[PDB]
């Protein structure tokens, strides 16, 4: 695709995704089943006031990917900006 075309296809799709995100259910399960499984992410970092997605990640790891992380030997590190700030900035105690 030409670079002028592949913006316009992405421009309309990015707006139609956000505008209809307002009125369609957020599917955070198979969202979590992408960046835990399809991408195999070690560092999951929440940025927010309180870990409502770090705790939402840890409940999906133990329910769906505990025997998965043992078999493929991934050590997933869950992190938030609320509590785990010293681990992100690499200023460890």
């Amino acid at each position: 695709m030409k670079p002028e075309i592949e913006q316009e296809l992405s421009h309309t799709l990015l707006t139609e995704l956000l505008a209809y995100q307002f009125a369609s259910p957020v599917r955070w399960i198979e969202t979590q089943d992408v960046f835990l499984k399809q991408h195999n992410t070690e560092r999951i970092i929440e940025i927010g006031p309180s870990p409502t997605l770090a705790g939402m990640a840890n409940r999906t790891i133990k329910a769906k990917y505990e025997s998965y992380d043992a078999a493929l030997s991934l050590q997933r590190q869950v992190l938030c900006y609320s509590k785990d700030a010293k681990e992100i900035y690499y200023k460890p105690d």
Binding site: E66, S67, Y68, A70, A71, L72, S73
Partner: protein, 170 residues
């Protein structure tokens, strides 16, 4: 089957040595055997759990597992390509075993090497590298004294084959 379900078949794990009723040796890649004992640490219990006050059928399984000082995946499919290469070197040299005199039991089948259609060396290289070990089938004795000339001594084969034959008079 829990661990190999998350892994390809080139990292599949199989039973290699069966040293008894409750003595097994697993074999595979070292990283996927490390995938085995991470799962087991979730379902095992520490030795000082003191399950004496919980009834028997609702106890948790306890075990000790650790890697052996062995630097090849013996008795598995990982070395099946090596088996054709080894007996080619047997053919290039003067390696052959003549007429047998005492019965030597097969390790996988449990049969005698005196009754073979095949030669012995191209049988035994299929038997160290590829085929698993059924040890208590292989020492299905009529025997009173058993001598381990092998390594280990107090840690050798003789101590683990002692516990299989504690009350059978060996």
């Amino acid at each position: 089957e829990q661990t190999n379900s998350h892994l390809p078949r080139e990292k599949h794990i199989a039973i290699s040595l069966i040293n008894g009723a409750r003595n097994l040796v697993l074999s595979g890649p070292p990283e996927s055997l490390y995938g085995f004992n991470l799962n087991l640490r979730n379902q095992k219990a520490p030795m000082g759990l003191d399950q004496s006050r919980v009834p028997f059928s609702e106890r948790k399984l306890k075990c000790s597992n650790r890697f052996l000082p062995i630097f090849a995946p013996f008795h598995s499919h990982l070395l099946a390509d090596a088996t054709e290469l080894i007996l080619d070197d047997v053919k290039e040299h003067g390696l052959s075993f003549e007429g047998l005199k005492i019965p030597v039991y097969d390790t996988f089948d449990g049969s005698d090497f005196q009754a073979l259609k095949e030669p012995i060396i191209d049988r035994v290289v299929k038997l160290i590298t590829e085929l698993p070990v059924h040890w208590e089938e292989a020492t299905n004795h009529k025997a009173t004294h058993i001598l381990d000339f092998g390594p280990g001594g107090v840690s050798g084969l003789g101590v683990l084959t002692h516990r299989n034959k504690e009350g059978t008079g060996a």
